[PDB]
Symmetry: D2
Subunit: 211 residues, 4 copies
């Protein structure tokens, strides 16, 4: 039935990504922000179902902002949690992603040059938004999205990094560069490799965990 | 059932607004452009229903552009045809709208100053879009919208003027100023008065004619 | 010469707005965020000077986002600091704004009902942005802007409230409703009255303090 | 000096692209639309120079829409005329672009599949806009822009196709699919090859013809 999303459990404990991301941020980010996207998405979807059945197009259009924002919220965060992992896990080793890192090096020259390019895009975001490594056709691209806009246009998301201030401010204050530098330690390259090899639908299977 | 919109008949013949708007434009604008919005809206709505029932949020967000564009298309054109009428009709006489014209004069000083102000907004639109007289709270405002974006945010639409090039180009070429000057002759002030007296829901009842 | 903006001093100490806004936030918000908008604006403006002299239109257009973002940043924050004051100051008393509060009560019914309307708009902002009371013509309107977009389209800014997460997160966490509730306590109604009685250029004279 | 742009002559007579594009459209498109962008750009730039020298940021931001719209107008149309040519010219033969067509086949599989992809993108534009083949890094990409937004973000424009209704409506009416089918005959693949082989600066040197 429509609008039965729930907050999925994290793949790890709230303090599992320290020192890169504090337990305080993880708990707030998950239990509060992600939770709010779930609740407000469900409310919008139930309202939309009525308007859709009634062929009430004005109400449907007026509901789009709530669905894109909160729906994008659960999409982006579902992907986000899955492509993070504890620094001690083997999945944080980029050796877990031989084909992806091979294509990264082909495209940007090296993994370090890619990290530099990605960092620049993340720090260049004006306001709230996300940075993404995506697969487009066979090639890789760095893209950013504003607010909670998701990567649903056709590309395969490989991994994303949240640049909303609530993702880092309590720990890094205005130092978003330090946040980005440290998040590399907790990137889940096993997840990234799997998405790189799969297609768009494969990548979004994770959303089933929220239903 | 979902997606059963049809093209409503015009309140007048295709040549009824000459010389202000040619019969060629009216026929193309109605039988082709408005028709296409109807057909593509219905298809998008049915596809959305599938995604909504499946809680497929990525597909829903990807469909929003088609629903807003084609849904706004049928909304704006339904309102547009209704607030046009033959120049010889009494409804084109602004005396048909005593309360609205009184509020216009209170707001812009006179009807002539409003029309001049409105023209400036219409001619200032970059690309495709619409100009609207709307009621917000108790006051009147001139607003513009891009492409087929409709006035569904809460304001009451009073009347709109289509500034897409297909609304005038065959007859006026690049002379959109002449188009605007001549469309005043075929504005349906009876409709404008009715919407001014009603609320938001009242104004959109015209959409029932497309179902 | 082009691009000689500097960070203006606050009208009060960093801890002067406590308990509504913490000294930590004020210092970070002013010395870091506002400072960065100043620095990046000056550099963008100088780069623009090069492009204008060269009639390099591609470069000019590519620079617009940096000028709007950082230029809006210094505009919005200059206005922001000026329309805040200590809760103990007489200027925080809305009695300091007889004409404005009369028009507010005229417009929304009462000051409390206006505060309710404003709060809803502020809390409805998706992502980063600002809420503004503005004077348009003779009437008052609540408007929101995204990111650092400023109110430069013609309205007279009366007062603004920053809803970027860096404006409240350290103190209120995700509780933006509590932030809004408490910021009313430090609104400078003397400033608001002055802007309300003046025109657009009058309101932006404050920018001279940054030159 | 600032704001001394002029309308460059076409590389051919107004009727040289028939039957693909009528002489009536070419004359209106060039002598009227492109001319207006030139005039309104010059006026915006002269006003901007004053605001820039005065560090008047509000005025600079308020002028951005006019500079982007009219500046993009002259950029896009300058490139547009240059990448069109008579259907009988050898430059209209894709054999004139061996390196480009080779990369196209690598990217989309074949020239026909690229044309199919481009056509879909062009016909999918909502409202006014442009479709572009661009070079990003070493790869080719199809992108669309709204209104007169130009491709100034870093990519090298290879060729563009105007999808504003004034580019085809007088001749094709609502039949934009027929317009796209026929414009392939007058694409200047010699020009496209040169841009593909050059860098971004190389591509925009054509603007010098407007000074
Ligand atoms: Fe987040
Ligand atoms: Fe239309
Ligand atoms: Fe701020
Ligand atoms: Fe054009």
């Amino acid at each position: 039935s429509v609008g039965t999303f729930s907050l999925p459990a994290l793949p790890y404990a709230y303090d599992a990504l320290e020192p890169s991301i504090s337990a305080q941020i993880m708990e707030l980010h998950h239990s509060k922000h992600h939770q709010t996207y779930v609740t407000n998405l469900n409310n919008a979807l139930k309202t939309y179902s009525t308007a859709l059945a009634a062929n009430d197009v004005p109400s449907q259009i007026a509901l789009q902002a709530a669905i894109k924002f909160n729906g994008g919220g659960i999409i982006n965060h579902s992907l986000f949690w899955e492509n993070l992992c504890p620094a001690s896990s083997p999945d944080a080793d980029p050796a877990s992603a031989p084909e992806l890192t091979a294509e990264i090096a082909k495209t940007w020259g090296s993994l370090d040059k890619f990290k530099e390019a990605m960092g620049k895009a993340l720090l260049g975001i004006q306001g709230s938004g996300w940075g993404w490594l995506v697969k487009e056709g066979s090639g890789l691209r760095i893209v950013t999205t504003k607010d909670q806009d998701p990567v649903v246009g056709g590309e395969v998301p490989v991994f994303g990094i949240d640049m909303w201030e609530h993702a880092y401010y309590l720990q890094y204050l205005n130092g978003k560069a330090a946040y980005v530098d440290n998040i590399w330690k907790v990137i889940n390259w096993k997840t990234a490799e799997q998405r790189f090899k799969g297609d768009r639908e494969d990548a979004f299977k994770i959303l089933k965990a929220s239903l």
